Amino acid sequence: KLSIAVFALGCFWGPDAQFGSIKGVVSTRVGYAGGTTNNPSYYNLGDHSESIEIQYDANVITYGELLNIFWNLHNPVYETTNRQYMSRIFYLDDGQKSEALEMKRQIEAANGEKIYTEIVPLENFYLAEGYHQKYYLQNTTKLYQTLKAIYGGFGNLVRSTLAARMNGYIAGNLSIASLKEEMDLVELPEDQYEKVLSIVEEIKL
């Protein structure tokens, strides 16, 4: 059992890569939330926002730390009506709601600007299409195919911690030194470790 945060802050590729780089984030998936239609998709979104679901270990990272990251990834000081890209925190319980409200207040006080992030109850989150998941990794063909085989297929790969970290590495949000420590955690047979490392190193160059 893990804890869940669901945030919306624009195109979800960046947040996937950013949050996926953080210790305590166990897995990520991108999708759609905030609207009033069942089973939305990319070109049929209705009123939903591009969102990220963050499965985190509360023993390692707090909701407050995730909120801090959220408000450091974008600066939502404009009011738009563009649902697809709007800044939203979808709270799952009253603790999340109160923490979000309090931090929003502190940001507004510290920097003198109204924040337009909507803090609203999570209704339904709908998983986005496969091609959107771990976007940067998925489009790094050799690394992607190697990790996919090791993890036993697409679904297993995208649900993994290592894929979240690898996607972050490709996007430039995780150092190779930190990535190697993450690789060590998975306890790969040494051949697979060396094969993945060579791709990762050749990527860093």
From TrEMBL:
<dbReference type="Pfam" id="PF20939">
    <property type="entry name" value="MsrA_helical"/>
</dbReference>
<keyword id="KW-0560">Oxidoreductase</keyword>
<dbReference type="InterPro" id="IPR036509">
    <property type="entry name" value="Met_Sox_Rdtase_MsrA_sf"/>
</dbReference>
<keyword id="KW-0711">Selenium</keyword>
<dbReference type="InterPro" id="IPR049006">
    <property type="entry name" value="MsrA_helical"/>
</dbReference>
<dbReference type="GO" id="GO:0033744">
    <property type="term" value="F:L-methionine:thioredoxin-disulfide S-oxidoreductase activity"/>
</dbReference>
<feature type="modified residue" description="Cysteine sulfenic acid (-SOH)">
    <location>
        <position position="11"/>
    </location>
</feature>
<dbReference type="InterPro" id="IPR002569">
    <property type="entry name" value="Met_Sox_Rdtase_MsrA_dom"/>
</dbReference>
<feature type="domain" description="Peptide methionine sulphoxide reductase MsrA">
    <location>
        <begin position="5"/>
        <end position="144"/>
    </location>
</feature>
<feature type="domain" description="Selenoprotein methionine sulfoxide reductase A helical">
    <location>
        <begin position="157"/>
        <end position="201"/>
    </location>
</feature>
<comment type="similarity">
    <text>Belongs to the MsrA Met sulfoxide reductase family.</text>
</comment>
<protein>
    <recommendedName>
        <fullName>Peptide methionine sulfoxide reductase MsrA</fullName>
        <ecNumber>1.8.4.11</ecNumber>
    </recommendedName>
</protein>
<keyword id="KW-0712">Selenocysteine</keyword>
<dbReference type="Pfam" id="PF01625">
    <property type="entry name" value="PMSR"/>
</dbReference>
<dbReference type="GO" id="GO:0008113">
    <property type="term" value="F:peptide-methionine (S)-S-oxide reductase activity"/>
</dbReference>
<comment type="function">
    <text>Has an important function as a repair enzyme for proteins that have been inactivated by oxidation. Catalyzes the reversible oxidation-reduction of methionine sulfoxide in proteins to methionine.</text>
</comment>
